[PDB]
Here is the input.
Amino acid sequence: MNNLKLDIVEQDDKAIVRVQGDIDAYNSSELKEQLRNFISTTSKKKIVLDLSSVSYMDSAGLGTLVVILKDAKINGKEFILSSLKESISRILKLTHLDKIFKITDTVEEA
Here is the structure.
């Protein structure tokens, strides 16, 4: 039933890549695929991520997201994270990722 996925929702001009599951070694190619390909497809430039379902994060996560910073910029797309758990927001900050990413609270504020 459940071992990591994305939901993906084209909004008005923003593309809401909702994520499902905690973010690990499966994501470490899954989301990487489901974004490098989707950023090619995407009609909407503002690639919002939703981390409301991300209960845990591995180092797998952060390397798999930061590589997409280029992939978005390969297609002139934006990139934002939203709904970050407090257990994960700190993680990005601690590993100095937050200072080099973008964080909001709802996908609507992205």
About this structure: The beta strands are 5-6, 9-10, 14-20, 46-50, 78-82. The two ends are 29 Å apart (CA to CA).
